[model samples]
Target: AGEILIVEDSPTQAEHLKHILEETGYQTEHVRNGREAVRFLSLTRPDLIISDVLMPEMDGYALCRWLKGQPDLRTIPVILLTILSDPRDVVRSLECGADDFITKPCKDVVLASHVKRLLSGVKRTESITLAF
Candidate 1:
């Protein structure tokens, strides 16, 4: 329940994220961009998808839209990363169906917390409801 697939263009950025998630007991696989992510997704499914908003091939917003279109993959939680503070970016992230969004230069603790919260929210069954 702790596997996370990271979609990032920069090798250094991807490794930095991998280190953080790995230190906190998450298994990770990395791909260069959203185009690559789609190729990988076709073969295997991971617990979560965390993507950088700015990438060469398919960018985070587009990837989120694509994922939401897929019946099989739409439920997978997504977290989009950005360096922008503009409200447009936040709006688009939500519109694209990202489970959460965070600033790129954010604190490690915040990113860790975001991932933890999103992952835990998925497939949670303790609060199921029963109605008459």
Candidate 2:
């Protein structure tokens, strides 16, 4: 299984996400905010990133934009989890290059499914690249 990096400000929320992913056999690392996530990404690459939309230092949109700007990290899948259910928020997420968006209070099964799908796609891409 691939490692997941979680960027969330709330301790309870972060722990909940971690538990869900860990129970499914994925290794996880947690960061407090988007700024910290950016710093962490500079040093390490994660297979996927799950970030909260509303954070202190930086928000998920900014982080997604930054990641998409980088050639090396832009390919990594980013999932934005937020309580904001507005359609505009979804548009913003896409505009910032988020691979997927999940509403807060998401079901564990749904989260797991999305993660699996994204990782599977990544695996396929890698396989095709190596085949070439």
Candidate 3:
């Protein structure tokens, strides 16, 4: 199972995401905002990060940029969860270095599938790195 760090401002939404991931056999940690997520990342590394677009302090875009800027953390997959349906928002998410984006109110199956794909990719990368 992979470890997933969830950055969400709303308690209800965080709990919902946590429940979904836990049920899928993933170890999960929750941070209320991007700043807290950054602080947590400084102390520990998660296999993947799922973040909300809007929050106090730092937002998901800023967090994605920050993570991409860090050589050690840049390879970790980041999934941005946003309610924004604008195509420009998706482009901005990509520009900020998010590996994927999920529209809010997403189905459990959809979220799980994306998580599995990203985690599998991470494992593949790790195996290649170790083999080299």
Candidate 4:
């Protein structure tokens, strides 16, 4: 099983993602905001991170920038799950070190498949893993 970090503001969306990820045997942790996501990452590193672009206190872009600043943590693959699908948003996410970006209203299967691909690229393991 892989460890997944989910950063989503909407309670309904967060719960839905959590349930789907858990059903796939992936250990999932949900954070309510970008700030909380950053804090949680400090304590627990996951195989993949899925975050929404717009959030209070700190948005996903800022969080991704912060994550990239740390030498030890910069390698973590980040997938931005946002409602904004503009070309500018896509460019900015890449600049902030997001490995991939998925639009909102994303289906569970698609989300899970993308996550699996990213995690697979990072050398996965069934055992508990930490990198930070």
Candidate 5:
């Protein structure tokens, strides 16, 4: 199975997310903050990135923007996980190049489905590139 990177500040949240994602058949890698997330991405670009918005040292918004700015990583799908439900937050996230946004304390099933959809879409897009 392809890997997905989970970038979250809280250890509990990271463990919970990793457990759910791994149970759903996705290989998982985790980073505690946006800085480590960027470092991990530099070393190994995962199939997709699932990140929390309010992490220290960088935050998901900046990380997503950085990834989007990189030509090689710009195509990676990024999902922002946040408790911030304000429309402004959503707009900022999307403007910063996040592919999806989900509120915190999300249902595992729903989150898993979103992950599946994003990964499937990425695979399809990459395959299309191969075809062309």
Candidate 6:
């Protein structure tokens, strides 16, 4: 069973992420855009959700928004891949309740650890945004 769902419009990028993650022994799946990603989520739950911030329709921000509201899926770790550390993405993703971020062109070990920590509960989803 695939443990990770990677949402990306570009086959090269999606394949790239899948390739890297799979190298570390994690089963990965891919979807074209956020709409397909949401559809995919409806049927199954992946251990982690990795998505590119930009898409042709219903980009990652929208996906993050939808993901965070579903009681059934909100707790899953989400890493929003960024284009260049854009402020808009950071703010929008934060507003959408994204769990974490990985800028485009990250090192293999970097993503591996981010996924590893999330899967390991290094930071619990329930406690990430306690404004108090």
Top TM-score model: 3
* lDDT of each candidate versus the true structure: 0.88, 0.89, 0.90, 0.84, 0.84, 0.84
In candidate 1, position 97 carries an lDDT of 81
- Candidate 5 per-residue lDDT over residues 4-115, each given as its tens digit: 9999888988899888888878999989888998788766868989988888999888998998898788888888987666888867776777888888778898988888
State each candidate's clash count: 0, 0, 0, 0, 0, 0
lDDT of 6 by residue, 8-127 (tens): 898987888888889888999899999999889877778899988778779988899899888778889899887655687557866877899877778988988999888888345343
lDDT of 3 by residue, 11-56 (tens): 9989999998999999999999999999999778899999998999
User: What are the per-residue Cα lDDT tens digits for candidate 2 across 11-54?
Assistant: 99899999989999999999999999989987787999999898
Worst 10 residues of 3 by lDDT: 123-132
Superior candidate under lDDT, 2 versus 5 = 2
Candidate 6's displacement at residue 17, Å, is: 1.0
Question: What is the C-alpha RMSD, rounded to one decimal, of candidate 6?
Answer: 5.9
Q: Which stretches of candidate 6 lie over 4 Å from their true place?
A: 84-86, 122-132
Clashes of 2: 0
| True-vs-predicted CA distance for residue 29, candidate 1, Å | 0.3
lDDT of 1 at 72: 74
Cα shift from native, residue 27, model 1 (Å): 0.5
Q: After superposition, how far is residue 63 of candidate 2 from its true place, in Å?
A: 0.4
* Cα lDDT, model 1, residue 1: 45
lDDT for model 4: 0.84
List runs of model 4 lying over 4 Å from the truth.
85-88, 124-132
Better of 3 and 5 by TM-score: 3
TM-score of every model versus the real structure? 0.87, 0.88, 0.89, 0.85, 0.87, 0.85
